[PDB]
Design a protein around this ligand. Structure first.
Ligand SMILES: Nc1ncnc2c1ncn2[C@@H]1O[C@H](COP(=O)(O)OP(=O)(O)OP(=O)(O)O)[C@@H](O)[C@H]1O
Ligand SMILES: Nc1ncnc2c1ncn2[C@@H]1O[C@H](COP(=O)(O)OP(=O)(O)OP(=O)(O)O)[C@@H](O)[C@H]1O
Ligand SMILES: [Mg+2]
Ligand SMILES: [Mg+2]
Ligand SMILES: [Mg+2]
Ligand SMILES: [Mg+2]
Length: 347
Protein backbone atom coordinates (compact mmCIF):
# COMPACT_ATOMS: atom_id res chain seq x y z
CA UNK A 1 0.00 0.00 0.00
CA UNK A 2 1.02 3.61 -0.70
CA UNK A 3 0.33 6.33 1.87
CA UNK A 4 2.19 9.39 0.50
CA UNK A 5 2.12 10.97 3.96
CA UNK A 6 4.27 14.04 3.07
CA UNK A 7 2.11 14.75 0.02
CA UNK A 8 -1.06 14.54 2.12
CA UNK A 9 0.47 16.92 4.68
CA UNK A 10 1.28 19.46 1.95
CA UNK A 11 -2.21 19.00 0.44
CA UNK A 12 -3.82 19.69 3.82
CA UNK A 13 -1.70 22.81 4.27
CA UNK A 14 -2.93 24.04 0.88
CA UNK A 15 -6.63 23.58 1.71
CA UNK A 16 -6.73 24.93 5.27
CA UNK A 17 -7.70 28.62 5.54
CA UNK A 18 -4.64 30.84 5.30
CA UNK A 19 -2.80 32.25 8.30
CA UNK A 20 -4.00 35.74 7.30
CA UNK A 21 -7.59 34.49 7.40
CA UNK A 22 -7.00 32.67 10.72
CA UNK A 23 -5.59 35.78 12.40
CA UNK A 24 -8.50 37.85 11.06
CA UNK A 25 -11.15 35.58 12.58
CA UNK A 26 -9.27 35.27 15.89
CA UNK A 27 -9.08 39.06 16.26
CA UNK A 28 -12.55 39.46 14.77
CA UNK A 29 -14.19 37.05 17.19
CA UNK A 30 -12.35 38.40 20.24
CA UNK A 31 -13.00 42.02 19.26
CA UNK A 32 -16.71 41.30 18.78
CA UNK A 33 -16.82 39.60 22.19
CA UNK A 34 -15.15 42.51 23.98
CA UNK A 35 -17.31 45.11 22.21
CA UNK A 36 -20.48 43.27 23.24
CA UNK A 37 -19.22 42.80 26.80
CA UNK A 38 -18.73 46.57 27.17
CA UNK A 39 -21.76 47.82 25.16
CA UNK A 40 -23.92 49.18 27.96
CA UNK A 41 -27.37 48.25 26.52
CA UNK A 42 -26.28 44.59 26.17
CA UNK A 43 -23.93 44.23 29.14
CA UNK A 44 -26.59 42.56 31.30
CA UNK A 45 -27.95 40.38 28.47
CA UNK A 46 -24.93 38.78 26.77
CA UNK A 47 -23.57 35.78 28.67
CA UNK A 48 -20.91 34.65 26.20
CA UNK A 49 -19.72 35.08 22.62
CA UNK A 50 -17.90 32.06 21.19
CA UNK A 51 -16.42 30.66 18.01
CA UNK A 52 -18.30 27.71 16.51
CA UNK A 53 -18.83 25.92 13.20
CA UNK A 54 -16.25 24.40 10.92
CA UNK A 55 -13.67 27.07 11.79
CA UNK A 56 -13.83 26.08 15.47
CA UNK A 57 -13.76 22.35 14.69
CA UNK A 58 -10.88 22.66 12.18
CA UNK A 59 -13.03 21.22 9.38
CA UNK A 60 -13.14 24.38 7.24
CA UNK A 61 -11.57 24.60 3.80
CA UNK A 62 -10.08 27.67 2.14
CA UNK A 63 -12.55 29.44 -0.17
CA UNK A 64 -11.56 30.03 -3.77
CA UNK A 65 -10.10 33.28 -5.07
CA UNK A 66 -10.82 36.33 -2.93
CA UNK A 67 -13.82 34.73 -1.22
CA UNK A 68 -14.02 35.19 2.53
CA UNK A 69 -14.35 32.13 4.79
CA UNK A 70 -17.59 31.73 6.74
CA UNK A 71 -16.82 32.10 10.46
CA UNK A 72 -19.68 31.03 12.72
CA UNK A 73 -20.17 32.81 16.05
CA UNK A 74 -22.70 32.19 18.83
CA UNK A 75 -23.91 34.97 21.10
CA UNK A 76 -25.46 33.41 24.22
CA UNK A 77 -28.04 35.62 25.94
CA UNK A 78 -29.99 35.24 29.18
CA UNK A 79 -33.27 36.19 27.49
CA UNK A 80 -36.47 34.22 28.21
CA UNK A 81 -37.32 32.44 24.95
CA UNK A 82 -40.89 31.78 26.10
CA UNK A 83 -41.53 35.51 26.39
CA UNK A 84 -39.38 36.93 23.56
CA UNK A 85 -39.29 35.73 19.96
CA UNK A 86 -36.11 35.28 17.89
CA UNK A 87 -36.67 38.65 16.20
CA UNK A 88 -37.17 40.29 19.60
CA UNK A 89 -33.71 39.02 20.56
CA UNK A 90 -32.13 40.02 17.25
CA UNK A 91 -33.72 43.48 17.38
CA UNK A 92 -31.48 44.34 20.35
CA UNK A 93 -28.29 43.94 18.32
CA UNK A 94 -29.12 46.44 15.57
CA UNK A 95 -27.79 49.53 17.43
CA UNK A 96 -24.66 47.58 18.33
CA UNK A 97 -24.05 46.59 14.70
CA UNK A 98 -24.69 50.15 13.52
CA UNK A 99 -22.21 51.50 16.09
CA UNK A 100 -19.29 49.13 15.51
CA UNK A 101 -19.84 47.67 12.02
CA UNK A 102 -21.65 50.36 10.00
CA UNK A 103 -21.94 49.45 6.33
CA UNK A 104 -20.48 46.00 7.03
CA UNK A 105 -23.45 43.98 8.35
CA UNK A 106 -26.62 42.41 6.97
CA UNK A 107 -29.48 40.36 8.38
CA UNK A 108 -29.70 36.95 6.67
CA UNK A 109 -32.76 35.31 8.22
CA UNK A 110 -31.63 33.50 11.35
CA UNK A 111 -28.21 35.17 11.47
CA UNK A 112 -26.29 38.39 11.01
CA UNK A 113 -23.46 38.58 8.47
CA UNK A 114 -20.51 40.85 9.22
CA UNK A 115 -17.88 41.48 6.53
CA UNK A 116 -14.34 41.81 7.89
CA UNK A 117 -11.17 42.30 5.86
CA UNK A 118 -10.50 38.62 5.16
CA UNK A 119 -13.44 36.70 6.71
CA UNK A 120 -17.23 36.91 6.99
CA UNK A 121 -18.72 36.41 10.45
CA UNK A 122 -22.04 34.51 10.67
CA UNK A 123 -23.54 35.51 14.02
CA UNK A 124 -26.47 33.65 15.62
CA UNK A 125 -28.27 34.96 18.70
CA UNK A 126 -29.18 32.24 21.18
CA UNK A 127 -30.75 31.83 24.60
CA UNK A 128 -30.47 29.37 27.48
CA UNK A 129 -33.90 27.69 27.86
CA UNK A 130 -33.31 26.74 31.50
CA UNK A 131 -34.28 29.08 34.34
CA UNK A 132 -33.06 30.11 37.76
CA UNK A 133 -30.11 28.33 39.33
CA UNK A 134 -29.94 25.82 36.47
CA UNK A 135 -29.38 28.70 34.05
CA UNK A 136 -26.70 30.13 36.32
CA UNK A 137 -24.73 26.88 36.36
CA UNK A 138 -24.85 26.59 32.57
CA UNK A 139 -23.72 30.22 32.26
CA UNK A 140 -20.54 29.25 34.14
CA UNK A 141 -19.68 26.77 31.38
CA UNK A 142 -20.25 29.36 28.65
CA UNK A 143 -17.93 31.76 30.52
CA UNK A 144 -15.11 29.20 30.80
CA UNK A 145 -11.88 29.09 28.80
CA UNK A 146 -13.09 25.80 27.28
CA UNK A 147 -15.84 27.77 25.55
CA UNK A 148 -14.17 31.16 25.06
CA UNK A 149 -10.92 29.96 23.46
CA UNK A 150 -10.53 31.31 19.91
CA UNK A 151 -8.10 28.54 19.00
CA UNK A 152 -9.47 25.65 16.96
CA UNK A 153 -9.40 21.94 17.69
CA UNK A 154 -6.33 21.34 15.49
CA UNK A 155 -4.40 23.75 17.73
CA UNK A 156 -5.69 22.20 21.01
CA UNK A 157 -6.08 18.47 20.33
CA UNK A 158 -6.48 17.76 24.07
CA UNK A 159 -9.44 20.15 24.34
CA UNK A 160 -12.18 18.99 26.68
CA UNK A 161 -15.64 20.36 27.38
CA UNK A 162 -15.01 21.18 31.04
CA UNK A 163 -15.02 24.48 32.92
CA UNK A 164 -11.74 23.37 34.56
CA UNK A 165 -9.87 22.78 31.29
CA UNK A 166 -7.03 25.16 30.46
CA UNK A 167 -4.94 25.32 27.27
CA UNK A 168 -1.91 23.07 27.04
CA UNK A 169 1.20 25.25 27.04
CA UNK A 170 3.32 22.58 25.34
CA UNK A 171 5.38 21.95 28.48
CA UNK A 172 -8.77 16.88 32.65
CA UNK A 173 -11.54 14.96 30.87
CA UNK A 174 -14.89 16.05 29.49
CA UNK A 175 -17.32 17.03 32.24
CA UNK A 176 -19.91 14.39 33.14
CA UNK A 177 -22.72 14.29 30.60
CA UNK A 178 -25.26 15.13 33.31
CA UNK A 179 -23.95 18.71 33.31
CA UNK A 180 -24.32 19.46 29.59
CA UNK A 181 -25.60 16.70 27.31
CA UNK A 182 -29.35 17.32 27.73
CA UNK A 183 -28.92 21.13 27.68
CA UNK A 184 -28.96 22.59 24.18
CA UNK A 185 -29.26 26.27 23.47
CA UNK A 186 -32.19 27.70 21.51
CA UNK A 187 -31.61 29.60 18.24
CA UNK A 188 -33.88 31.04 15.55
CA UNK A 189 -35.39 28.60 13.08
CA UNK A 190 -34.11 28.89 9.51
CA UNK A 191 -37.45 30.14 8.12
CA UNK A 192 -39.87 30.90 10.96
CA UNK A 193 -39.81 33.36 13.86
CA UNK A 194 -39.66 30.44 16.28
CA UNK A 195 -36.97 28.98 18.55
CA UNK A 196 -35.29 25.69 17.77
CA UNK A 197 -32.63 23.73 19.62
CA UNK A 198 -28.89 23.54 18.87
CA UNK A 199 -25.96 22.18 20.87
CA UNK A 200 -22.72 23.40 19.27
CA UNK A 201 -20.60 22.64 22.34
CA UNK A 202 -21.71 18.99 22.22
CA UNK A 203 -20.85 18.82 18.51
CA UNK A 204 -17.40 20.33 19.17
CA UNK A 205 -16.85 17.84 21.98
CA UNK A 206 -17.85 14.88 19.82
CA UNK A 207 -15.52 16.04 17.02
CA UNK A 208 -12.61 16.44 19.41
CA UNK A 209 -13.15 12.92 20.77
CA UNK A 210 -13.60 11.37 17.31
CA UNK A 211 -10.40 13.06 16.19
CA UNK A 212 -8.50 11.60 19.16
CA UNK A 213 -9.98 8.16 18.48
CA UNK A 214 -8.79 8.54 14.84
CA UNK A 215 -5.23 9.63 15.75
CA UNK A 216 -5.71 13.18 14.47
CA UNK A 217 -6.88 12.16 11.00
CA UNK A 218 -10.64 12.81 11.33
CA UNK A 219 -10.67 16.59 10.92
CA UNK A 220 -8.18 16.30 8.05
CA UNK A 221 -10.34 13.71 6.32
CA UNK A 222 -13.40 15.99 6.58
CA UNK A 223 -11.40 18.76 4.88
CA UNK A 224 -10.12 16.38 2.19
CA UNK A 225 -13.61 15.12 1.36
CA UNK A 226 -15.02 18.66 1.40
CA UNK A 227 -12.26 19.62 -1.05
CA UNK A 228 -13.07 16.68 -3.31
CA UNK A 229 -16.72 17.77 -3.30
CA UNK A 230 -15.79 21.35 -4.24
CA UNK A 231 -13.41 20.24 -7.01
CA UNK A 232 -16.06 17.91 -8.48
CA UNK A 233 -19.09 20.15 -7.86
CA UNK A 234 -20.26 19.96 -11.49
CA UNK A 235 -20.48 16.15 -11.30
CA UNK A 236 -22.14 15.94 -7.86
CA UNK A 237 -25.52 16.94 -6.42
CA UNK A 238 -25.86 20.29 -4.67
CA UNK A 239 -26.25 18.51 -1.30
CA UNK A 240 -24.95 17.16 0.98
CA UNK A 241 -22.43 19.88 1.78
CA UNK A 242 -21.36 21.76 4.86
CA UNK A 243 -22.28 20.28 8.19
CA UNK A 244 -24.47 17.39 6.90
CA UNK A 245 -21.51 16.33 4.74
CA UNK A 246 -19.16 16.51 7.73
CA UNK A 247 -21.63 14.43 9.74
CA UNK A 248 -21.76 11.76 7.03
CA UNK A 249 -17.95 11.59 7.09
CA UNK A 250 -17.77 11.33 10.88
CA UNK A 251 -20.33 8.54 10.69
CA UNK A 252 -18.55 6.60 7.94
CA UNK A 253 -15.05 6.85 9.41
CA UNK A 254 -14.09 4.02 11.76
CA UNK A 255 -12.19 4.58 15.00
CA UNK A 256 -8.48 3.81 14.88
CA UNK A 257 -7.51 5.52 11.60
CA UNK A 258 -3.78 5.27 10.89
CA UNK A 259 -3.34 7.39 7.75
CA UNK A 260 -5.13 9.70 5.35
CA UNK A 261 -4.91 7.28 2.43
CA UNK A 262 -6.20 4.32 4.46
CA UNK A 263 -8.91 6.44 6.09
CA UNK A 264 -10.24 7.78 2.78
CA UNK A 265 -10.63 4.29 1.34
CA UNK A 266 -12.12 2.93 4.58
CA UNK A 267 -14.68 5.70 5.02
CA UNK A 268 -15.81 5.56 1.39
CA UNK A 269 -16.06 1.77 1.43
CA UNK A 270 -18.03 1.89 4.70
CA UNK A 271 -20.32 4.61 3.34
CA UNK A 272 -21.11 2.43 0.32
CA UNK A 273 -21.73 -0.76 2.31
CA UNK A 274 -23.60 0.87 5.19
CA UNK A 275 -26.01 2.77 2.91
CA UNK A 276 -26.34 0.09 0.18
CA UNK A 277 -29.83 -0.95 1.30
CA UNK A 278 -30.97 2.68 1.63
CA UNK A 279 -29.58 3.40 -1.83
CA UNK A 280 -31.39 0.38 -3.25
CA UNK A 281 -34.62 1.75 -1.76
CA UNK A 282 -33.94 5.19 -3.31
CA UNK A 283 -34.17 6.66 0.19
CA UNK A 284 -31.80 8.41 2.61
CA UNK A 285 -30.57 7.80 6.16
CA UNK A 286 -31.94 9.37 9.34
CA UNK A 287 -28.92 10.33 11.46
CA UNK A 288 -28.98 11.57 15.04
CA UNK A 289 -27.22 14.85 15.61
CA UNK A 290 -24.34 14.66 18.08
CA UNK A 291 -25.68 17.83 19.69
CA UNK A 292 -29.48 17.41 19.74
CA UNK A 293 -30.02 13.65 19.59
CA UNK A 294 -33.66 13.86 18.48
CA UNK A 295 -32.73 15.88 15.37
CA UNK A 296 -32.07 14.23 12.01
CA UNK A 297 -28.99 15.91 10.54
CA UNK A 298 -30.23 14.82 7.09
CA UNK A 299 -33.72 16.32 7.49
CA UNK A 300 -33.38 18.75 4.55
CA UNK A 301 -31.44 16.36 2.29
CA UNK A 302 -33.59 14.85 -0.45
CA UNK A 303 -33.43 11.15 -1.25
CA UNK A 304 -32.57 12.07 -4.84
CA UNK A 305 -29.55 14.09 -3.72
CA UNK A 306 -28.45 11.39 -1.27
CA UNK A 307 -28.56 8.71 -3.96
CA UNK A 308 -26.77 10.93 -6.49
CA UNK A 309 -24.13 11.55 -3.83
CA UNK A 310 -23.83 7.81 -3.15
CA UNK A 311 -23.09 7.35 -6.86
CA UNK A 312 -20.44 10.05 -6.65
CA UNK A 313 -18.79 8.34 -3.68
CA UNK A 314 -18.85 5.05 -5.60
CA UNK A 315 -16.85 6.66 -8.42
CA UNK A 316 -14.44 8.37 -6.01
CA UNK A 317 -13.88 5.16 -4.03
CA UNK A 318 -12.62 3.27 -7.09
CA UNK A 319 -10.00 5.95 -7.67
CA UNK A 320 -9.05 6.07 -3.99
CA UNK A 321 -8.68 2.28 -3.82
CA UNK A 322 -6.40 2.31 -6.85
CA UNK A 323 -4.29 5.12 -5.36
CA UNK A 324 -3.79 3.23 -2.09
CA UNK A 325 -2.98 -0.01 -3.92
CA UNK A 326 -0.55 1.59 -6.39
CA UNK A 327 3.07 0.46 -6.34
CA UNK A 328 4.52 3.63 -7.92
CA UNK A 329 4.38 6.96 -6.02
CA UNK A 330 3.79 9.02 -9.17
CA UNK A 331 0.85 6.89 -10.33
CA UNK A 332 -0.62 6.97 -6.82
CA UNK A 333 -0.37 10.76 -6.64
CA UNK A 334 -1.88 11.18 -10.10
CA UNK A 335 -4.85 9.13 -8.89
CA UNK A 336 -5.30 11.28 -5.77
CA UNK A 337 -5.08 14.34 -8.03
CA UNK A 338 -8.06 13.00 -9.99
CA UNK A 339 -10.03 13.48 -6.77
CA UNK A 340 -8.37 16.59 -5.33
CA UNK A 341 -6.89 18.53 -8.23
CA UNK A 342 -3.56 20.31 -8.36
CA UNK A 343 -3.33 21.20 -4.65
CA UNK A 344 -2.30 17.58 -4.03
CA UNK A 345 1.40 17.52 -4.99
CA UNK A 346 3.36 14.98 -6.96
CA UNK A 347 6.26 13.46 -4.96
N1 LIG B 1 -28.26 19.95 9.55
C1 LIG B 1 -27.57 20.35 10.65
N2 LIG B 1 -27.51 19.59 11.74
C2 LIG B 1 -26.84 19.95 12.86
N3 LIG B 1 -26.11 21.07 12.98
C3 LIG B 1 -26.12 21.92 11.93
C4 LIG B 1 -26.82 21.59 10.69
N4 LIG B 1 -26.63 22.64 9.82
C5 LIG B 1 -25.88 23.53 10.51
N5 LIG B 1 -25.55 23.08 11.74
C6 LIG B 1 -24.74 23.74 12.78
O1 LIG B 1 -24.57 25.12 12.41
C7 LIG B 1 -23.16 25.36 12.17
C8 LIG B 1 -22.97 26.42 11.11
O2 LIG B 1 -23.49 25.94 9.88
P1 LIG B 1 -22.66 26.09 8.53
O3 LIG B 1 -23.61 25.86 7.39
O4 LIG B 1 -21.81 27.32 8.59
O5 LIG B 1 -21.74 24.77 8.61
P2 LIG B 1 -20.17 24.53 8.87
O6 LIG B 1 -20.08 23.23 9.61
O7 LIG B 1 -19.57 25.76 9.49
O8 LIG B 1 -19.54 24.27 7.43
P3 LIG B 1 -19.00 25.40 6.35
O9 LIG B 1 -17.50 25.14 6.44
O10 LIG B 1 -19.58 24.91 5.03
O11 LIG B 1 -19.45 26.71 6.87
C9 LIG B 1 -22.57 23.99 11.87
O12 LIG B 1 -21.17 23.89 12.06
C10 LIG B 1 -23.35 23.12 12.85
O13 LIG B 1 -22.86 23.27 14.18
N1 LIG C 1 -25.80 28.91 12.50
C1 LIG C 1 -26.08 27.87 13.30
N2 LIG C 1 -25.47 27.71 14.48
C2 LIG C 1 -25.73 26.68 15.30
N3 LIG C 1 -26.60 25.71 14.99
C3 LIG C 1 -27.24 25.76 13.79
C4 LIG C 1 -27.02 26.85 12.87
N4 LIG C 1 -27.80 26.65 11.76
C5 LIG C 1 -28.43 25.46 11.98
N5 LIG C 1 -28.15 24.95 13.19
C6 LIG C 1 -28.59 23.68 13.76
O1 LIG C 1 -28.97 22.89 12.65
C7 LIG C 1 -30.33 22.42 12.80
C8 LIG C 1 -30.97 22.39 11.44
O2 LIG C 1 -31.01 23.69 10.93
P1 LIG C 1 -31.58 23.91 9.44
O3 LIG C 1 -31.26 25.34 9.08
O4 LIG C 1 -31.14 22.82 8.50
O5 LIG C 1 -33.18 23.75 9.57
P2 LIG C 1 -34.20 24.33 10.65
O6 LIG C 1 -35.55 24.42 9.96
O7 LIG C 1 -33.70 25.59 11.24
O8 LIG C 1 -34.17 23.15 11.69
P3 LIG C 1 -35.30 22.56 12.65
O9 LIG C 1 -36.59 23.26 12.30
O10 LIG C 1 -35.34 21.10 12.31
O11 LIG C 1 -34.76 22.86 14.05
C9 LIG C 1 -30.96 23.40 13.78
O12 LIG C 1 -31.99 22.80 14.54
C10 LIG C 1 -29.79 23.76 14.67
O13 LIG C 1 -29.62 22.73 15.66
MG1 LIG D 1 -19.75 27.62 8.69
MG1 LIG E 1 -22.43 29.68 8.56
MG1 LIG F 1 -37.37 24.38 10.88
MG1 LIG G 1 -18.16 5.44 12.33
Amino acid sequence: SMELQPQFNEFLANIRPTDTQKEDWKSGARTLRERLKNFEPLKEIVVSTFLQGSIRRSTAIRPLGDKRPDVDIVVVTNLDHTRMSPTDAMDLFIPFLEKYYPGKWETQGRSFGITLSYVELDLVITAIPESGAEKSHLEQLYKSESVLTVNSLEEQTDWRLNKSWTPNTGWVEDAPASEWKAHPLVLPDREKNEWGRTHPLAQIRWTAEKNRLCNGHYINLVRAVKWWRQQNSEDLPKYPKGYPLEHLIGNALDNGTTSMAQGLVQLMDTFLSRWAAIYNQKSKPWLSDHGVAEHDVMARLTAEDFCSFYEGIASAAEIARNALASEEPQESAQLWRQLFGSKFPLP
